[PDB]
Design a protein around this ligand. Structure first.
Ligand SMILES: Nc1ncnc2c1ncn2[C@@H]1O[C@H](COP(=O)(O)OP(=O)(O)OP(=O)(O)O)[C@@H](O)[C@H]1O
Ligand SMILES: Nc1nc2c(ncn2[C@@H]2O[C@H](COP(=O)(O)OP(=O)(O)O)[C@@H](O)[C@H]2O)c(=O)[nH]1
Ligand SMILES: [Mg+2]
Ligand SMILES: [Mg+2]
Ligand SMILES: [Mg+2]
Lengths: 80, 101, 132, 208, 352, 51
């Protein structure tokens, strides 16, 4: 199980599931019918978000990893 | 030629306990578990109780090997405090000095 | 990087401190890599760290990176106070160093725990005496 | 003592060291040159050069300390000073402009003057004469007068009369009473004075 | 008035106001903040006879985000974090004041740690028999929730029928005030009344009836451990508490029409070291997973300008009574001993 | 309080390193301790205590 894993893998994780769901709701709010899993999870922004979450989960948490995570989430949620 | 009859009784106890140690260990193992049937464990209880009393290791006493003093013995040297001090105060125990600090 | 610094040692009870005092700084003290107010939550301990710099009117002018081990909370603050004062002597005038010495900021405190004696309760505390 | 007799006590006064050399007297100059040749003890962990350092409050805190727990003793002291300040601010806010002028809001001023009001001017010493002990009026040294005021204040606050009242509440209330020349601690001083006046004829029993 | 600003509208605060104290009116203090304010800050308001809050960058950043909130998108979770006593609670309160003045419905949990410790009457829930009700904690919150949102409690009308007892039941179409009144009046039904209030507000905010702010201080409690113990002294999990189970649901971003602003706190936390302050250190794995994705907002010690304005505000109120405190030497000692930590500075100035 | 994976990995490691494989309570573990050391009566300090 994921509890047994000693290395965090972003694939099939709660992070991937939660960000996917959030992005789908955002698309529905814009009335866009592009709901393809692959496209949504293939954007560069998702790659930055995936990298940030993996660092936080696998490496020592510090103020710089939290700031990197903040900026990645702000881009995916269109918060400026 | 042991110091006294008490030391001689302890010498016999240490000898008898040595002779019976394996048998006592084997029977005791049968009793010190919850795996084997209680009927078997009850028969083992009787068998270890029927062994001679002087085979029981708890009856051994660490007496001073020089004077037979049953108390005040230092286990590392097997000597009573009085005999140890006599040898130590004369400088006859390697590396042991009076402590001041 | 070419920044001037001095290093000294300090001892208090069983605590031993090593302090690096930088010639120029903002007043940041790191104790074992932790901010001093987080490392020393007790106010009295933080007052001991202020005393060397306050006495020479140099609060907010140096950075300090010190490492302390052994002893308790108060001994460690005393050991750091001594290590910082000794290292800070490199960046003050000779007259100021003498004032620091006459204020008790550069002396190793020799007061250490006395041993318990046999036949007594403590180092000095005797057993209750019974006249009859 | 782990210090040899040569070791001298540290002097922790920033202003003393900064004094202009010209103002120094010939004796003062000698005292400074001599100190440069003398061993000095390490400054104790209590007193520092801080401008907020108050020696009287530090001594009062130590007298409150139990079993070396200075952190708890210091916590009680600062809570008392805050409690006094908050009570005076409330009294100040509810007072009129004329009354507001006379209300003291500095807790240190209140603490110092409350203890001064509790200091006894005369004491009593038990003197054994002809097999009978007599309480003889005697002059008290300044240190003893100040110590007695602090001990009476702390003893009063520790009395069991106060039920489930925390020390900062008790001490702040008692300090404010003494600051106004009221309360049991002031009464204890008056009783000592009255007892000494009654025994004035026994003053000759003292031989110093 | 160097430390003060004349702009008392939290919607008009910008970067020009950084460091300046803005006054919260006594009416807002009673209505917006019946609860939530730090214990020691409440003492200051009583002593100074005024509530003044420093405009700082953490609140300014979060106010900027909440002014540009897309109410169509799922609610965004903002997490205020920072070291002990840097001002996370009072930054959250400044934001609650903004939304409260813009006619948002406020869901202010002042301290979630109180719900997982020191519970005298832990009753088994009737709605679900595997969960525990907390009558005293629920009723306490309901009374304050009523005070803050009294204006809206008549307009919002329940959309279901809720069976309280065999005899009593709230009917569809009645105002939500009735649910709040039942929980307050009948304290055995308080936990379920809180659940219903949360269930109704989440549903009806998505429908576009009102804007909902979910302000949870001490949010790290929800996914940690409890000191509450069963009859046999076995540990109880936070999920088993019905009151916590219902608040967790408010934290998910599966609704829209509002925002979810939370603040961490190691003070009052259970089984956390003194110096733990980072999100994953306090939230844990389960806590981080529940909030991810969220926007962390750092709260730091006072900067040099902010530190000077705080001293000036204390001096203007005559709070600093020591004769050396107004001097430059005293101010340097004040800075060193606190290291510009707002909480340490307030505590040291309280007796100076 | 172990996952199946963790439980089966611990049982494999215990078999590899020669430790007890079956589930054994602390009472029955005394049998292992009894046969891993010499009885006190069999130690040279005990039976050769006296010259
Ligand atoms: N914006 C502010 N305006 C005025 N005072 C403030 C402000 N922020 C902090 N303070 C001061 O600092 C104290 C601590 O603030 P607060 O309780 O918000 O901190 P916190 O970070 O939430 O603390 P904890 O980590 O214990 O939960 C306040 O009681 C107040 O005296
Ligand atoms: N007494 C009572 N409480 C209710 C009723 N419906 C909902 N609640 C409360 O409101 C909470 C939220 O409702 P719901 O989403 O149905 O909860 P769930 O069944 O635990 O998922 C519940 O956990 C209950 O505490 C009801 O009919 N009666
Ligand atoms: Mg024996
Ligand atoms: Mg003792
Ligand atoms: Mg807080």
């Amino acid at each position: 199980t994921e509890a047994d894993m000693e290395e965090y893998i972003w694939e099939n994780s709660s992070s991937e599931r939660n960000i996917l769901e959030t992005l789908l709701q955002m698309k529905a709010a814009e009335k866009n019918m592009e709901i393809n899993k692959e496209e949504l999870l293939g954007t560069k922004e998702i790659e930055e978000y995936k990298k940030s979450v993996v660092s936080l989960k696998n490496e020592e948490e510090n103020e710089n990893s939290i700031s990197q995570y903040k900026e990645s989430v702000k881009r995916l949620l269109n918060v400026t | 030629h042991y110091v006294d009859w008490r030391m001689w009784r302890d010498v016999k106890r240490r000898k008898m306990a040595y002779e019976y140690a394996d048998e006592r260990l084997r029977i005791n193992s049968l009793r010190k578990n919850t795996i084997l049937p209680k009927i078997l464990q009850d028969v083992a209880d009787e068998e270890i109780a029927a062994l001679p009393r002087d085979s029981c290791p708890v009856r051994i006493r660490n007496r001073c090997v020089m004077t037979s003093r049953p108390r005040g013995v230092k286990r590392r040297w097997r000597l009573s405090r009085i005999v140890f001090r006599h040898l130590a105060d004369h400088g006859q125990l390697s590396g042991i000095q009076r402590a001041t600090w | 990087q070419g920044m001037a610094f001095s290093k000294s040692e300090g001892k208090r009870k069983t605590a031993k401190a090593e302090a690096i005092v930088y010639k120029h700084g903002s007043g940041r003290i790191k104790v074992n890599g932790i901010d001093y107010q987080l490392y020393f939550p007790i106010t009295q301990d933080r007052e001991q760290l202020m005393f060397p710099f306050h006495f020479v009117d140099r609060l907010g002018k140096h950075d300090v990176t010190c490492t302390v081990s052994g002893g308790g909370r108060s001994a460690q603050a005393g050991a750091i106070r001594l290590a910082m004062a000794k290292a800070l002597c490199s960046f003050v005038t000779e007259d100021e160093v003498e004032w620091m010495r006459q204020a008790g900021l550069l002396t190793t405190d020799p007061r250490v725990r006395e041993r318990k004696k046999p036949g007594q309760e403590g180092a000095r505390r005797k057993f209750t005496w019974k006249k009859r | 003592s782990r210090y040899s007799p040569e070791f001298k006590d540290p002097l922790i006064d920033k202003e003393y060291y900064r004094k202009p050399v010209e103002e120094l007297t010939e004796e003062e100059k000698y005292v400074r040159e001599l100190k440069k040749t003398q061993l000095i003890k390490a400054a104790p962990a209590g007193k520092t050069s801080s401008v907020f350092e108050d020696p009287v409050i530090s001594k009062f805190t130590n007298m409150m300390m139990i079993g070396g727990n200075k952190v708890l003793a210091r916590s009680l002291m600062i809570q008392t000073l805050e409690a006094v300040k908050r009570k005076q601010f409330e009294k100040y806010h509810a007072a009129s402009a004329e009354e507001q002028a006379t209300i003291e809001r500095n807790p240190y001023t209140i603490f110092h003057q409350a203890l001064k009001n509790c200091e006894p001017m005369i004491g009593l010493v038990p003197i054994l004469k002809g097999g009978r002990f007599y309480q003889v009026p005697v002059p008290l040294p300044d240190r003893r007068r100040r110590f007695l005021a602090m001990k009476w204040m702390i003893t009063e606050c520790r009395d069991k009369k106060h039920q489930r009242t925390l020390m900062p509440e008790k001490l702040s209330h008692k300090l404010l009473e003494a600051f106004h020349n009221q309360g049991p601690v002031i009464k204890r001083k008056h009783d000592l004075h009255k007892m000494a006046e009654a025994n004035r004829a026994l003053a000759h029993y003292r031989w110093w | 008035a160097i430390s003060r600003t004349n702009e008392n509208d939290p919607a008009k605060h910008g970067d020009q106001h950084e460091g300046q104290h803005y006054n919260i009116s006594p009416q807002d203090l009673e209505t917006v903040f019946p609860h939530g304010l730090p214990p020691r800050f409440v003492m200051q308001v009583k002593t100074f006879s005024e509530a003044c809050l420093m405009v700082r960058k953490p609140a300014l950043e979060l106010l900027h985000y909440l002014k540009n909130t897309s109410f169509a998108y799922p609610a965004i979770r903002y997490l205020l974090y920072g070291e002990k006593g840097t001002g996370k609670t009072l930054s959250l309160c400044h934001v609650i004041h903004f939304c409260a003045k813009q006619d948002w419905l406020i869901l202010h949990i002042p301290d979630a740690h109180l719900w997982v410790k020191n519970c005298r009457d832990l009753l088994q829930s009737s709605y679900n028999k595997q969960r525990f009700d907390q009558p005293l904690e629920a009723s306490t919150w309901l009374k304050n929730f009523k005070t803050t949102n009294e204006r809206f409690l008549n307009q919002i009308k329940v959309q279901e029928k809720y069976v309280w007892n065999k005899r009593e039941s709230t009917e569809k179409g009645s105002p939500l005030g009735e649910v709040v009144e039942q929980g307050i009046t009948r304290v055995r039904n308080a936990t379920d009344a809180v659940g219903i209030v949360l269930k109704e507000l989440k549903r009806q905010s998505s429908l576009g009836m009102f804007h909902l702010l979910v302000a949870v201080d001490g949010i790290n409690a929800l996914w940690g451990r409890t000191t509450l113990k069963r009859e046999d002294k076995s540990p109880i999990a936070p999920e088993e508490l019905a009151l916590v189970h219902n608040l967790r649901k408010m934290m998910k971003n599966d609704w829209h029409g509002g925002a979810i602003v939370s603040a961490l706190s190691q003070t009052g936390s259970l089984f956390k070291p003194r110096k733990a302050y980072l999100p994953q250190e306090l939230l844990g794995k389960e806590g981080f997973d529940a909030l991810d994705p969220f926007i962390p907002i750092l709260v730091s010690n006072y900067n040099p300008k902010e530190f000077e304005s705080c001293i000036q505000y204390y001096l203007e109120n005559n709070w600093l009574q020591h004769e050396k405190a107004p001097t430059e030497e005293g101010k340097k000692e004040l800075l060193f001993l606190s290291n510009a930590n707002p909480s340490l500075l307030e505590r040291h100035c309280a007796y100076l | 309080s172990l996952s199946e994976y963790a439980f089966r990995m611990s049982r494999l490691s215990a078999r590899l390193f020669g430790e007890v494989t079956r589930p054994t309570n602390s009472k029955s573990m005394k049998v292992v301790k009894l046969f891993s050391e010499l009885p006190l009566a069999k130690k040279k300090e005990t039976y050769d205590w006296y010259p």
